[PDB]
Structure formats: C-alpha cells, structure tokens
C-alpha cells in the first residue's frame, strides 16, 4: 500500500518539494518528493498524506495552506478523488463543510484560501497511481 508517491501539478514544470517551514513548491525527482511521499493507510476515499518516511508531516492550514511541518493532527487527513483521466481532486476530509480545492504554484505560495475554482490548477493534480484503493 505504501510506495514513493509524488504530487505533480500540471501548471508548468515539476512539483514535488516541501520545506520544513511548511511550504510545498516545484522540484524534479524520480517520483520522490522531498525524500519519500506516502499516501495510504485509510479507507476508500479518505487518505493520509505523509511527506518523507520520518521527518515531515503533510498538514492542512485552518485558513487555507498546505505544509509539512511535523505536527500530528486531524488536519493531515485528506480526501483523494482520482477521475482516472490523468487527474485527481483533493479536499479537506475533516473539513468537509469547507471542501475547498487545494493547488499551489511553482512560486511555492499555494492557493487554497484566496479562491479555488478557476484555473486547472484547482482541479488538475497528477500524483502516483499508488493509493489505498
Ligand atoms: O487570485 P490569486 O490568489 O492571485 O490566484 C490566481 C488564480 O489561480 P487560482 O484561482 O487557480 O488559485 C489564477 O487562475 P485563473 O482565475 O486566472 O483561472 C491564476 O492564473 P493561471 O490560470 O494562469 O495560473 C493566477 O496565476 P498567475 O498569476 O501565474 O497568472 C493565480 O495567481 P498566483 O499564481 O499568484 O496565485
């Protein structure tokens, strides 16, 4: 169930890097994000996103941001929606009431709180097929 996963965003370039400070940006590697991205160990739909075997912790921001600063919390539970056609959607599982689509930019400054809807960046994430089906 666990394998070197990555979160590629079809927005010009390669995306798969996370800074301890709590920020994700562009980068190129062999399906390995910062070291090893793990997305699995949950029920159908709900997924646990782990960045780096031991060190980083992918967590969502209450306002609208995605960080990997090691901080165990429900905010780490996300919903993975793969539509097969080389694209998937992610939403804050715990915050179903505010299912705001994620999506960052090569600059690093993600865009979830500003206004997610317009632009394929909001709905055009291509990760690794490895998931807890
Ligand atoms: O209003 P913002 O917070 O500054 O975000 C916008 C917005 O991106 P999202 O609404 O998907 O978050 C634009 O999308 P559109 O509404 O125009 O479809 C996008 O334009 P692109 O579709 O070309 O990415 C633009 O990016 P850019 O400034 O490179 O044109 C980006 O601004 P930021 O990249 O600064 O977040």
């Amino acid at each position: 169930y666990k394998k070197p996963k990555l979160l590629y965003c079809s927005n010009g370039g390669h995306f798969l890097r996370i800074l301890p400070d709590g920020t994700v940006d562009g980068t190129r590697d062999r399906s390995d994000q910062h070291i090893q991205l793990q997305l699995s160990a949950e029920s159908v739909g709900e997924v646990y996103i782990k960045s780096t075997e031991t060190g980083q912790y992918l967590a969502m921001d209450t306002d609208g941001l995605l960080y990997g600063s090691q901080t165990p919390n429900e905010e780490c539970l996300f919903l993975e929606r793969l539509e097969e056609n080389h694209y998937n959607t992610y939403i804050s599982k715990k915050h179903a009431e505010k299912n705001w689509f994620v999506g960052l930019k090569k600059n690093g400054s993600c865009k979830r709180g500003p206004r997610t809807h317009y632009g394929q960046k909001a709905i055009l994430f291509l990760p690794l097929p490895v998931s807890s089906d």
Side-chain angles (χ1 to χ4, degrees):
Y1 64 88
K2 62 264 191 67
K3 282 183 174 177
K5 190 162 178 172
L6 72 164
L7 181 66
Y8 188 100
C9 306
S10 317
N11 200 262
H14 290 64
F15 305 68
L16 52 116
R17 179 168 69 176
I18 182 82
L19 297 311
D21 290 64
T23 311
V24 62
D25 83 310
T27 274
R28 70 173 65 73
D29 210 301
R30 188 64 196 166
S31 315
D32 274 307
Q33 180 229 39
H34 168 251
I35 290 179
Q36 176 191 268
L37 215 169
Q38 285 148 322
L39 193 161
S40 266
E42 284 299 313
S43 87
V44 58
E46 306 164 303
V47 292
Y48 175 84
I49 309 178
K50 159 72 92 57
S51 290
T52 308
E53 190 66 82
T54 50
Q56 280 290 270
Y57 185 92
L58 203 296
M60 73 185 78
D61 187 275
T62 207
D63 172 61
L65 207 271
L66 296 83
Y67 43 94
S69 311
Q70 220 300 333
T71 315
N73 204 335
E74 305 165 294
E75 277 38 72
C76 197
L77 284 303
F78 299 80
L79 203 302
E80 185 172 66
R81 189 194 204 201
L82 188 66
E83 206 182 288
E84 182 181 83
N85 187 30
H86 67 281
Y87 116 73
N88 96 102
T89 17
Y90 286 108
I91 52 174
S92 311
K93 175 277 193 304
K94 168 174 156 180
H95 303 257
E97 315 322 291
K98 296 185 58 138
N99 52 267
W100 291 100
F101 300 102
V102 298
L104 65 139
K105 213 74 161 73
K106 50 188 174 184
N107 155 272
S109 312
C110 307
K111 298 290 151 254
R112 211 291 284 131
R115 166 216 56 188
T116 207
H117 256 178
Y118 285 103
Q120 291 185 89
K121 75 105 262 190
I123 305 86
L124 196 62
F125 311 117
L126 182 62
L128 197 65
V130 297
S131 289
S132 297
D133 172 76

